[PDB]
């Protein structure tokens, strides 16, 4: 028996999917059976050439190494400590819509990654969605075991500064913060400012494989008299 | 399910028997001595001896401490029973003792311990069991390590007992029998029952009680004289129920260092938060929480404030109960008396002779007493002592007995022998000597009890006895009739008459009949309390009396209040006024709900202040008539039993020449005659010791002490010095007062 | 003053002597009977010619001197400590199975040594035995003086991290995990997982060396009457 199995089953569905992806990335990269020619994150292919061959490999193939181990560890502690609050952001219902604008966040951040030439689009998306959830109810502080009264809503910025001073590769998280602010403004402006036949209809195929769940009436009882 | 029984204590002291109600044997088809398998916590299964005991209810199973440990279950738990008479006699069994009791024994356990304990006792035993065997000095324990047949077998004469081997190290799960249980406490049955009542739910079923949604008690104050086992009681309760008992001492904390001591307290509390329903015990509060008057420095104020804040914030939290040990609630700061704080109050009184007897029985369990021990006599002679006193007495009595045999015991150079130890016996002379080299500590302390004097101890006054019974017993016997009639019973009864009639004896007799506590207050104590300390002492006296309800309070030498007030001194007016005012202001505050009675007695009714003679206060007045002839004969007979007896001169005749004599005078005459009889006995032994000097060892026949044959010579001596202690002028004054009251009212 | 002597002199004779030989083998290696440069297990040389003098010589010895004694001494300390801990239960009267497990671990590790090109097979033995120990009694709660989440089947990734920061050649702890889990499966899971016919068959000579002992009845006295 393995307590790891039910521990991971205890993880809520969104963090379940993200953890599955982020643990499959290193294993898939280190498998070595599959030809890496499909997966190199080659800048020349993705930037100038059309190269429909590798339009999505950026988030899957990733050179894992001792480049962000300490930051990844502190984020692992953060998720282990607060995934409950992480998963409960205003989307227990309509979770298909939640995944919808998370995919929209992915497409906007990869647009940024095409326009700009940063290093890793892994932290910025998750930190941006977590911090936008926080900002919708901003400014209640929190601290860890030894944190006496240290203020919250600085942790993204504390990490940014720590990476900026010692080490490197901090620009992508701050550009993700910028695009997240853009997304925060857009989720309020775009749907009501302009129409355009509400863009396009959201596909029901995702509902076909992974439907959303709504109210259930169960069964009633005759009151009688 | 007709197999679940709530565990209960077994009156039987055997370690392999169980007591059941008769329908249990009727339904389960159980014979006497049947081996029945039991179920419980930790999946522990064993067998015992089925014994009939109708005392326990059908759901109640009587079963002792050792088997409770073997089953790893506590009191109040339900067990499952199933018959299994298919056991077989043991053939060869290898058993071993647990290591942490064998230290320094150097002896063969088989013959010294195992042979007498297991003498064809037919004890059903199993592999891997634990049991205890008493010894002359220790209480050793053994474990069955190998059995044949397995796993169950029966003690049989053909039992090859492999008793020698390496001592067994502790099983690392403790469950030691060295703990303290309810059986280890004597003379506190009422208080123990009260605590066991109001501790049960918060500790046994925290989930159910929490789901109920009722605030449990949180503050309990055990108070009494030091060295009475209060900490022992708390530890025993904690071990019995099972908790995370944490102990805190006063001096060890208050004089810790600088000002960080508070953290330790905080530390203690937070640990309870991580450790389930737990008991927090703190000792010697007055040493750290006195009244603010005594507080001279500042740090103590900070300590008290911090502890108050800590304990008041204990609302909800967990099912943690806190109790404190102290001596006098007066010394405690009143601020720690509000609701939510310590509100439950329990006092531990000084045990009587009987309680001393159970304490001695507990402490002498290991000792090999010789056939000369009268524990009851020692308990009678040891009034004014405490549990620590008796423990020390037993310890140094055993030490004296051993030291008397230093020659017998090989002093040698290692662990002593066990057989020599087993050969030691304790003599009553050792106990007498221990008494000689002893002193109690309580001594000058008020004792509350039910007196022993019965009705027949005093003759005459049949109408007086009937009136007292009518005034006292029936109102508490039949409150319903009073409720129907809408009546309040009287409480203040006063006695007036010639001194020396045994009025105190009457009070003791009526208290004994009512079977309630008795409290005695003397005029000496009152006059001592006159100057200065009067108010608080009276208040605490009445508080104690209310605490021990139902009870009878007695007052003596009341007229002495006036004696220094109006007389040759005339200077104690302020103290007398203070005392009288305190008494009046406090006694009327008694409520009819309390079943406490007040009795006053005096021999100078004229000088008594009229304010007491008020309804609600002392109103019932009973004269004390002198015994007459047959009454005098009855008193003489009552005083005559004692030990000597001699019917050679008409006692009724001597009563008839002694008409108009007080009962105390008659008792004095009896004791004078007894002294003359002792003089005759001294004459006898003196002539013995003189005339066997003349004839060397002139003791061939047994010359016993003279049989009680008190001759008319002694009574003629008594009448030669005959004192009419009652004075006729005072008798006339008493009659004048009685007739004045009769005509006036 | 030398409490080391007092602590060593209180050790049980069997475990003291076995552990003394276990720690004296590295002393023989350190003396210089065979140079450490002559301990590499050349694959082709072992394949073609014998070279049977150094398949296990480097396994039982570790190049420890007055530069890294702390790790070696603590490893042997916990080795003996866990040896006694496993001596407490189960192997209190059945040393045959204990020695069978030790030799099983050695056979597995030497099979892996022959198969692949690893160099220092001392720490790999540590992972093997430590994991088989920790997993023989999985699902239990234990804590050291400052145990935070000290739990079964969790020390393997702890030593994963500690060897990642200090050391290398990750495959060793992988093989220790594999052998520990295989033994654990063979103990409880295998009998009702894959039918029957358990493979716990001790060879005759191995049982001849150290057979399981039996409790003696000792002398007894009849109770009589
Ligand atoms: N009811 C009792 N039953 C048996 N032994 C008792 C009893 N009361 C007192 N003793 C004996 O007297 C001793 C007095 O108790 P002990 O000194 O251990 O604690 P305490 O009275 O609660 O107070 P403190 O902790 O201040 O000493 C006990 O240890 C025990 O030997
Ligand atoms: N059965 C009895 N009847 C009358 N007097 C008794 C009896 N037994 C003892 N006494 C005497 O009564 C005396 C105590 O009386 P006490 O209660 O002091 O009366 P008072 O308080 O009026 O002086 C004792 O000295 C004793 O000699």
XYZ file of N, CA, C and O in Angstrom, chain A residues 78-141:
256
model
N 4.860 26.300 -0.394
C 3.696 27.178 -0.418
C 2.447 26.425 -0.847
O 1.382 26.576 -0.238
N 2.555 25.610 -1.896
C 1.397 24.838 -2.330
C 1.016 23.792 -1.292
O -0.164 23.653 -0.960
N 2.000 23.082 -0.732
C 1.710 22.110 0.316
C 1.015 22.760 1.501
O 0.202 22.117 2.176
N 1.305 24.032 1.760
C 0.730 24.704 2.914
C -0.628 25.325 2.613
O -1.462 25.436 3.518
N -0.879 25.738 1.365
C -2.055 26.553 1.081
C -2.813 26.140 -0.177
O -3.506 26.979 -0.765
N -2.718 24.878 -0.606
C -3.451 24.461 -1.797
C -4.955 24.518 -1.582
O -5.711 24.666 -2.549
N -5.405 24.390 -0.334
C -6.830 24.505 -0.050
C -7.351 25.879 -0.451
O -8.325 25.992 -1.201
N -6.694 26.939 0.021
C -7.074 28.279 -0.407
C -6.768 28.495 -1.881
O -7.442 29.291 -2.544
N -5.760 27.798 -2.407
C -5.423 27.931 -3.819
C -6.563 27.458 -4.713
O -6.856 28.081 -5.740
N -7.219 26.359 -4.341
C -8.186 25.721 -5.228
C -9.581 26.332 -5.144
O -10.412 26.075 -6.023
N -9.864 27.131 -4.117
C -11.216 27.612 -3.858
C -11.490 28.998 -4.433
O -12.251 29.763 -3.828
N -10.903 29.347 -5.574
C -11.131 30.681 -6.090
C -12.342 30.820 -6.989
O -12.262 30.591 -8.201
N -13.471 31.201 -6.384
C -14.673 31.680 -7.079
C -15.083 30.799 -8.257
O -15.792 31.248 -9.161
N -14.651 29.538 -8.274
C -14.963 28.705 -9.427
C -15.230 27.257 -9.048
O -14.902 26.345 -9.815
N -15.811 27.018 -7.871
C -16.310 25.678 -7.578
C -17.375 25.277 -8.589
O -17.377 24.145 -9.089
N -18.286 26.192 -8.903
C -19.142 26.044 -10.055
C -18.441 26.511 -11.313
O -17.342 27.066 -11.281
N -19.110 26.278 -12.447
C -18.637 26.551 -13.804
C -17.135 26.313 -13.952
O -16.428 27.160 -14.516
N -16.607 25.176 -13.487
C -15.157 24.973 -13.593
C -14.689 24.852 -15.028
O -13.511 25.099 -15.308
N -15.582 24.479 -15.946
C -15.227 24.489 -17.359
C -14.879 25.897 -17.816
O -13.903 26.097 -18.545
N -15.652 26.893 -17.376
C -15.280 28.277 -17.653
C -13.956 28.636 -16.997
O -13.173 29.414 -17.561
N -13.692 28.097 -15.803
C -12.412 28.357 -15.160
C -11.268 27.874 -16.033
O -10.354 28.639 -16.358
N -11.328 26.615 -16.463
C -10.314 26.106 -17.378
C -10.307 26.894 -18.679
O -9.269 26.996 -19.336
N -11.448 27.479 -19.049
C -11.517 28.271 -20.271
C -10.632 29.510 -20.174
O -9.769 29.738 -21.034
N -10.790 30.308 -19.113
C -9.884 31.456 -19.087
C -8.494 31.103 -18.568
O -7.573 31.896 -18.762
N -8.291 29.933 -17.960
C -6.916 29.481 -17.752
C -6.224 29.132 -19.067
O -5.040 29.440 -19.247
N -6.938 28.511 -20.007
C -6.370 28.311 -21.335
C -6.145 29.643 -22.035
O -5.178 29.805 -22.787
N -7.041 30.606 -21.812
C -6.822 31.944 -22.353
C -5.580 32.595 -21.747
O -4.821 33.279 -22.445
N -5.363 32.400 -20.446
C -4.131 32.862 -19.819
C -2.922 32.196 -20.456
O -1.896 32.841 -20.694
N -3.033 30.901 -20.744
C -1.944 30.195 -21.409
C -1.657 30.780 -22.787
O -0.493 30.977 -23.153
N -2.702 31.068 -23.567
C -2.472 31.577 -24.917
C -1.897 32.991 -24.872
O -1.015 33.336 -25.665
N -2.349 33.824 -23.930
C -1.783 35.168 -23.843
C -0.335 35.127 -23.364
O 0.513 35.877 -23.864
N -0.023 34.245 -22.410
C 1.351 34.171 -21.929
C 2.268 33.581 -22.994
O 3.433 33.972 -23.091
N 1.774 32.660 -23.825
C 2.638 32.145 -24.883
C 2.763 33.167 -26.009
O 3.786 33.211 -26.698
N 1.753 34.019 -26.199
C 1.920 35.162 -27.089
C 3.031 36.064 -26.572
O 3.880 36.539 -27.338
N 3.048 36.304 -25.260
C 4.134 37.068 -24.657
C 5.476 36.371 -24.860
O 6.482 37.019 -25.171
N 5.505 35.049 -24.689
C 6.720 34.277 -24.884
C 7.190 34.227 -26.319
O 8.361 33.930 -26.569
N 6.291 34.477 -27.267
C 6.691 34.627 -28.660
C 7.216 36.032 -28.932
O 8.236 36.204 -29.607
N 6.524 37.051 -28.417
C 6.978 38.424 -28.607
C 8.266 38.685 -27.835
O 9.231 39.228 -28.384
N 8.299 38.305 -26.563
C 9.483 38.464 -25.736
C 10.306 37.175 -25.780
O 9.864 36.145 -26.287
N 11.523 37.240 -25.241
C 12.464 36.134 -25.358
C 12.940 35.672 -23.987
O 14.145 35.534 -23.755
N 12.003 35.437 -23.071
C 12.340 35.043 -21.709
C 12.750 33.569 -21.671
O 12.967 32.925 -22.701
N 12.857 33.020 -20.462
C 13.490 31.731 -20.218
C 12.511 30.610 -19.893
O 12.632 29.517 -20.455
N 11.540 30.831 -19.007
C 10.642 29.761 -18.592
C 9.262 30.319 -18.277
O 9.123 31.224 -17.449
N 8.254 29.802 -18.970
C 6.853 30.152 -18.730
C 6.170 29.130 -17.829
O 5.118 28.590 -18.168
N 6.754 28.848 -16.666
C 6.190 27.880 -15.735
C 5.693 28.555 -14.464
O 4.521 28.418 -14.102
N 6.568 29.286 -13.775
C 6.137 30.058 -12.609
C 5.117 31.134 -12.969
O 4.068 31.203 -12.305
N 5.333 31.978 -13.994
C 4.489 33.180 -14.129
C 2.998 32.905 -14.214
O 2.221 33.634 -13.594
N 2.567 31.864 -14.928
C 1.132 31.621 -15.059
C 0.508 31.263 -13.715
O -0.531 31.819 -13.330
N 1.127 30.332 -12.989
C 0.569 29.890 -11.716
C 0.602 31.020 -10.698
O -0.380 31.258 -9.981
N 1.727 31.733 -10.613
C 1.800 32.852 -9.681
C 0.782 33.926 -10.040
O 0.166 34.520 -9.152
N 0.560 34.160 -11.336
C -0.394 35.178 -11.755
C -1.818 34.798 -11.384
O -2.576 35.636 -10.886
N -2.211 33.545 -11.620
C -3.583 33.166 -11.299
C -3.787 33.128 -9.788
O -4.822 33.578 -9.274
N -2.790 32.636 -9.048
C -2.880 32.656 -7.595
C -2.998 34.081 -7.072
O -3.830 34.369 -6.202
N -2.200 35.001 -7.614
C -2.216 36.360 -7.097
C -3.435 37.142 -7.563
O -3.850 38.072 -6.875
N -4.024 36.805 -8.712
C -5.275 37.462 -9.085
C -6.408 36.973 -8.191
O -7.265 37.763 -7.765
N -6.417 35.676 -7.863
C -7.358 35.194 -6.859
C -7.164 35.932 -5.542
O -8.138 36.314 -4.884
N -5.908 36.140 -5.145
C -5.631 36.890 -3.925
C -6.098 38.337 -4.037
O -6.675 38.879 -3.092
N -5.867 38.973 -5.187
C -6.165 40.394 -5.334
C -7.665 40.651 -5.327
O -8.117 41.700 -4.852
N -8.456 39.706 -5.844
C -9.905 39.854 -5.739
C -10.373 39.960 -4.291
O -11.454 40.504 -4.041
N -9.590 39.461 -3.337
C -9.836 39.625 -1.905
C -8.539 39.988 -1.186
O -8.135 39.350 -0.213
N -7.855 41.016 -1.682
C -6.489 41.318 -1.270
C -6.418 41.765 0.193
O -7.422 42.122 0.817
N -5.200 41.710 0.737
C -4.726 42.409 1.939
C -5.083 41.801 3.293
O -5.081 42.544 4.284
N -5.386 40.509 3.397
C -5.330 39.826 4.686
C -3.985 39.115 4.788
O -3.674 38.245 3.969
N -3.195 39.483 5.796
C -1.824 38.998 5.912
C -1.811 37.562 6.415
O -2.822 37.054 6.915
